[PDB]
């Protein structure tokens, strides 16, 4: 086993108590310690799972994300200040990084620390060995759930490729003088291979931080790194589901008719699709046991609820979004019965689905994309929401996040597109666009109906059917689909008149066109006629 006399070369001193590779049982007792108060304290729910409060931050803080610009990242990273498109990869000086490291290492010094060694990536040949350090038990619990838990043997000869140090309790008072966004920070240094977290307690920063690193390393090696869920059928056929947050990746991949590979982060190499994680991070707002049985059943001892409202009697009010709409629950992947094991990976994907929640109510429930349209929509990374479905009234607001996850991209969008296209062509994969959002009714299509569309896609029903073309976006949609209302197939029918759809389609088309303009600086990018909507 490891010894305390080997964990101070990171700049952490005077650690008297070291809890290495904490067990779920110890994490439980740490979280429910009767004398524990504050944000570290968890509460036991009637479901047997512990629930915690992540504080001020209930989601990621992109504005506080920084990457050190040195000679390791200078000419490879997609920088926020290099006009190559808008992104959160803000350059940080090596000097300021040292200051931040100082804050975090001092905050963790003289404290009882949890050290969790885990893997990011199901394949030994490309996975990262990560060592997580924190003084908060539930943060250690979060990483234990979300990352791949190594075997006793692997832990014996564990050699960290990356170090993640969570100093949530500390803040940076010099941020103004350093030109940073706030007193908080989520910084990355690829030379020292380390991630620092200050101010925010949100565990998600650790999960996506390593995802961001995988997104840097894998594509440069010819391996696609994807923000998608993935599952496989009895026949062995594999599907991947891309989409921005809340579009359905986790909800829809957890499907009774297929084995779950992963719900959020995957790679695609010469052998196939593999999960980067050892757990799932499901959304719990308005959670329905009837609609999502598997996910609900996963909420038990060892799962970790985040920010949900817990009543005096321990019952959970999943509908309460008064604190945040981003209530979550993390759990080891085996909390889902029908998953792929012992290793979360499978063959090449033959079905690539792009999920989008179109608040504009213009995109059809399902359409088959051409090769060029696949690239166009991948780079577009579209989804929409109302200016405030909990704030004001209707006002569809678009979000164009390249590759369906710009916030996690370390390389240029085209680099992800290139590797994805290569893997797709070699596998003869077909792409589909699915609107898990709204139509003319103003009400989101039901999960039941959506699972039916996915069923049709995966079993070939969609491909082996006649289609017509939706104008403006020129999307091929089937005339009918088993277990699906034929009326909704054409979004124009959910409106009192096709004219209403027309006006909104025109607006959305213009948004797409304007958003894509930045990619036309290359001959290939000039592929404006592709999926490219046309007025």
- Smallest gap, in angstroms, from Cβ of residue 264 to Mn ion? 5
Interface with Mg ion, residue 254, by CB under 5 A: no
Question: Strand 185-189's sheet: what is its strand order?
Answer: 18-20, 113-120, 128-134, 162-167, 194-198, 185-189, 65-68, 90-92
Do the strands 349-356 and 430-435 form a parallel or antiparallel pair, or are they unpaired?
Answer: parallel
The residue annotated as part of the active site, out of 207, 227, 368, 504, is 227
The residue annotated as part of the active site, out of 45, 129, 212, 245, is 245
Interface with Mg ion, residue 250, by CB under 5 A: yes
Query: Does the annotation place 37 within a ligand binding site?
Result: no
> Which tokens is 462 given?
């969609």
- Smallest gap, in angstroms, from Cβ of residue 202 to ligand ATP? 13
Residue number with CB closer to ligand ATP (338 or 497): 338
Interface with Mg ion, residue 145, by CB under 5 A: no
Buried b / exposed e along 302-334 (16+ C-beta atoms within 10 A): bbbbbbbebeeeeebebebbeebebbbbbbbbe
- Residues between 200 and 229 with contacts to Mg ion, criterion CB under 5 A: none
Residue number with CB closer to Mn ion (406 or 456): 406
Nearest Cα to Cα of residue 206 among 296, 107, 116: 116
Interface with ligand ATP, residue 461, by CB under 6 A: no
From the list Mn ion, Mg ion, ligand ATP, none, pick the one residue 252 interacts with, judged by a Cβ distance below 5 to 8 Å according to partner type: ligand ATP
Residue number with CB closer to Mg ion (89 or 250): 250
Q: Is 520 a residue of the active site?
A: no
- Pairwise CA distance, residues 175 & 171, whole Å: 9
- Pairwise CA distance, residues 476 & 175, whole Å: 51
- Smallest gap, in angstroms, from Cβ of residue 333 to Mn ion? 15
DSSP string computed for 356-416? E--TTS-S-SEEE--HHHHHHHHHH-EEEEETTTTSSS--EEEEE-GGG-GGG-SS-HHHH
- Figure out which of the listed residues 215, 245, 344, 494 binds ligand ATP, where binding follows CB under 6 A: 245
The residue annotated as part of the active site, out of 54, 250, 401, 410, is 250
The residue annotated as part of the active site, out of 41, 60, 348, 504, is 60
Interface with ligand ATP, residue 250, by CB under 6 A: yes
From the list ligand ATP, Mg ion, Mn ion, none, pick the one residue 107 interacts with, judged by a Cβ distance below 5 to 8 Å according to partner type: none
From the list Mn ion, Mg ion, ligand ATP, none, pick the one residue 248 interacts with, judged by a Cβ distance below 5 to 8 Å according to partner type: ligand ATP
From the list ligand ATP, Mg ion, Mn ion, none, pick the one residue 87 interacts with, judged by a Cβ distance below 5 to 8 Å according to partner type: none
- Smallest gap, in angstroms, from Cβ of residue 328 to ligand ATP? 8
- Smallest gap, in angstroms, from Cβ of residue 511 to Mn ion? 23
**End-to-end alpha carbon distance in the chain:** 66
Residue 391: how many other CB atoms lie within 10 Å: 8
- Residue 362 region by backbone torsions, left for phi larger than 0, else alpha for psi between -120 and 50, else beta: alpha
Nearest Cα to Cα of residue 158 among 3, 13, 341: 3
Q: Is 264 a residue of the active site?
A: yes
Interface with Mg ion, residue 89, by CB under 5 A: no
Nearest Cα to Cα of residue 244 among 446, 398, 457, 368: 398
- Pairwise CA distance, residues 401 & 246, whole Å: 13
Q: Which residue has the tokens 């650690």?
A: 15
Q: Is 131 a residue of the active site?
A: no
- Pairwise CA distance, residues 156 & 1, whole Å: 6
Summarize as ranges the residues that interact with Mn ion (CB under 5 A). Answer: 264
Q: Is 249 a residue of the active site?
A: yes
- Residues between 266 and 305 with contacts to ligand ATP, criterion CB under 6 A: 281-283, 285
> Which tokens is 50 given?
């512990």
The residue annotated as part of the active site, out of 88, 264, 358, 490, is 264
- Pairwise CA distance, residues 279 & 24, whole Å: 14
Residue number with CB closer to ligand ATP (70 or 325): 325
- Pairwise CA distance, residues 184 & 280, whole Å: 26
Residue number with CB closer to ligand ATP (31 or 306): 306
Task: Give the per-residue contact string, 188-227, with ligand ATP (x = CB under 6 A; - = no).
Answer: ----------------------------------------
- Pairwise CA distance, residues 247 & 283, whole Å: 11
Q: How many residues does the chain have?
A: 535
Q: Is 60 a residue of the active site?
A: yes
Residue number with CB closer to ligand ATP (371 or 447): 447
Q: Is 534 a residue of the active site?
A: no
Query: Does the annotation place 443 within a ligand binding site?
Result: no
Task: Say how many residues touch ligand ATP, by CB under 6 A.
Answer: 20
The residue annotated as part of the active site, out of 208, 351, 368, 492, is 208
The residue annotated as part of the active site, out of 127, 131, 328, 504, is 328
- Residue 309 CA from chain centroid, whole number: 23
Burial of 482 (0-12, 13-18, 19+ CB in 10 A): exposed
Annotated binding site for substrate: 60, 202, 208, 328
* Residues contributing to the site for ligand ATP (CB under 6 A): 243, 245-252, 264, 281-283, 285, 436, 444-447, 450
Q: Which residues are catalytic?
A: 60, 208, 227, 245, 249-250, 264, 328
Return binding residues for ATP. 208, 227, 243-251, 292, 328, 444-445, 450
Which chain residues interact with Mg ion by CB under 5 A? 249-250, 264
């Amino acid at each position: 086993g490891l010894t305390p006399q080997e964990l101070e070369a990171y700049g952490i001193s005077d650690v008297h108590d070291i809890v290495y590779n904490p067990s779920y049982d110890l994490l439980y007792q740490e979280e429910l310690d009767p004398s524990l108060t504050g944000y570290e304290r968890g509460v036991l729910t009637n479901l047997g799972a512990v629930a915690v409060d992540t504080g001020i931050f209930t989601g990621r803080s992109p504005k506080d994300k920084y990457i050190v610009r040195d000679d390791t990242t200078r000419d490879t990273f997609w920088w926020a200040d290099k006009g190559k498109g808008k992104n959160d990869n803000k350059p940080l000086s090596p000097e300021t990084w040292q200051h931040l490291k100082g804050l975090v290492t001092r905050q963790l010094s003289g404290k009882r620390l949890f050290v969790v060694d885990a893997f990011c990536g199901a394949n030994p040949d490309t996975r990262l060995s990560v060592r997580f350090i924190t003084e908060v038990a539930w943060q250690a619990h979060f990483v234990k759930n979300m990352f791949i838990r190594p075997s006793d043997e692997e832990l014996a000869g564990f050699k960290p490729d990356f170090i993640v140090m969570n100093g949530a309790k500390c803040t940076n008072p010099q941020w103004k003088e350093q030109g940073l966004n706030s007193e908080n920070f989520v910084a990355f240094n690829l030379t020292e291979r380390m991630q620092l977290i200050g101010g925010t307690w949100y565990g998600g920063e650790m999960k996506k931080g390593m995802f961001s690193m995988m997104n840097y390393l894998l594509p440069l090696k010819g391996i696609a790194s994807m923000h998608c869920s993935a599952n496989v059928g009895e026949k062995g056929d594999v599907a991947v589901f891309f989409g921005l947050s809340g579009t359905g990746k986790t909800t829809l991949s957890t499907d009774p008719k297929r084995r779950l590979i992963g719900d959020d982060e995957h790679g695609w190499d010469d052998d196939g699709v593999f999960n980067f994680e050892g757990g799932c991070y499901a959304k719990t707002i308005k959670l329905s046991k009837e609609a999502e049985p598997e996910i609900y059943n996963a909420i038990r001892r060892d799962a970790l609820l985040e920010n949900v409202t817990v009543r005096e009697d321990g019952t959970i009010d999943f509908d309460d979004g008064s604190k945040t709409e981003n209530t979550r629950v993390s759990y080891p992947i085996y909390h889902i019965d029908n998953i792929v094991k012992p290793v979360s990976k499978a063959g090449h994907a033959t079905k690539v689905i792009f999920l989008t929640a179109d608040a504009f109510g213009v995109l059809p429930p399902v359409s088959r994309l051409t090769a060029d349209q696949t690239q166009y929509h991948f780079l577009s990374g579209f989804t929409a929401k109302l200016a405030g479905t909990e704030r004001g009234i209707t006002e569809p607001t678009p979000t164009f996040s390249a590759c369906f996850g710009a916030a996690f991209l370390s390389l240029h969008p085209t680099q992800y597109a290139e590797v994805l296209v290569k893997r797709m062509q070699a596998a003869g994969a077909q792409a589909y666009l699915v609107n898990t959002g709204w139509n003319g009714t103003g009400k989101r299509i039901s999960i039941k109906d959506t699972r039916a569309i996915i069923d049709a896609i995966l079993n070939g029903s969609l491909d082996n059917a006649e289609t017509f073309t939706l104008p403006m976006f020129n999307l091929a949609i089937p005339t009918e689909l088993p277990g699906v209302d034929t009326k909704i197939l054409d979004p124009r029918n959910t409106y009192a008149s096709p004219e209403q759809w027309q006006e909104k389609a025109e607006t959305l088309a213009k948004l797409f066109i304007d958003n894509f303009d930045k990619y036309t600086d290359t001959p290939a990018g000039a592929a404006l006629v592709a999926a490219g909507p046309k007025l």
